[PDB]
Amino acid sequence: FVIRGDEVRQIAPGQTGNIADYNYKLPDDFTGCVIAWNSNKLDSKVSGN
Amino acid sequence: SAVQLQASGGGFVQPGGSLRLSCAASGWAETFGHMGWFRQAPGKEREFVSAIDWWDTVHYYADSVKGRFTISRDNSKNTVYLQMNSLRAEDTATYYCAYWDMDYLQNSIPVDYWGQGTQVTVSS
Amino acid sequence: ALGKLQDVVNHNAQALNTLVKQLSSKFGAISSVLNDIFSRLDPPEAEVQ
């Protein structure tokens, strides 16, 4: 999924916030991995996305 | 984690002037943490100068360089920049950009990685 | 004259008392009670405490 820079800090067990309450919630016993990378070149345009 | 820091800038300057330093980071780390600069005077100990969060929200500066040094971040190059002025003789030293890999900064004692020394010299 | 019997009670209750008292020991943690150690701190590193 695409997210607003700062938000990345929410995608983690026990975190709160809009994304971590109404959009995507992680269980406290989660195991796995998370990859996150900026995509200002593609997902953002000066013409408005 | 595997993070490489590339430093750029430094040279010989006149007192009270301005110069150019910038540090870029590459690789992959645990999280988006803080980034700062460390000063080493010849014959002295290595002390921190400042520390900026990744998202440019909160800034931390040393009491000895407050109001004289500032640090900002790029918007399309992922390279931290810093500006300075009114340089004095004590500023002749070796500077290193360092990456702190935690979300919230508490103190400057634990340092993760270090960059190549950039020697800056000021005199008449 | 009746020391020995008087001892066996005195030996017992006192020991019991000590066991109760050490329920209040911190044991190197930061909060003896459980709601401080659970609500105020994230569970992943509260489990160690």
Tokens of B58: 């909160």
Chain C residues with CB inside 8 Å of A28's CB?
Answer: 43-44
- Residue B110 to residue B106: CA distance in whole angstroms: 10
How far out from the chain centre does Cα B37 lie? 2
Instruction: Count Cβ atoms below 10 Å from residue C24 Cβ, excluding itself.
Output: 8
A-to-C residue pairs, Cβ atoms closer than 8 angstroms = 6
User: Distance from B70 to chain A by nearest Cα, in Å?
Assistant: 22
Chain B residues with CB inside 8 Å of A43's CB?
Answer: none
Residue type, A18: N
Helix (H) or strand (E) holding A37, with range, is none
Residues B35 and B23: beta-carbon distance below 8 Å: yes
Tokens of B124: 């008449």
The strand pair at B12-13 and B118-122 is best described as parallel
Chain A residues with CB inside 8 Å of B58's CB?
Answer: none
Closest residue in A to B55 (Cα) is A6
Dihedral sign from CA coordinates of A16, A18, A20, A25: positive
- Residue B50 to residue B61: CA distance in whole angstroms: 4
- Residue B103 to residue B79: CA distance in whole angstroms: 18
Among B7, B1, B25, B10, smallest CA distance to B115 is for B7
Tokens of C40: 């105020």
Name the structure determination technique. cryo-EM
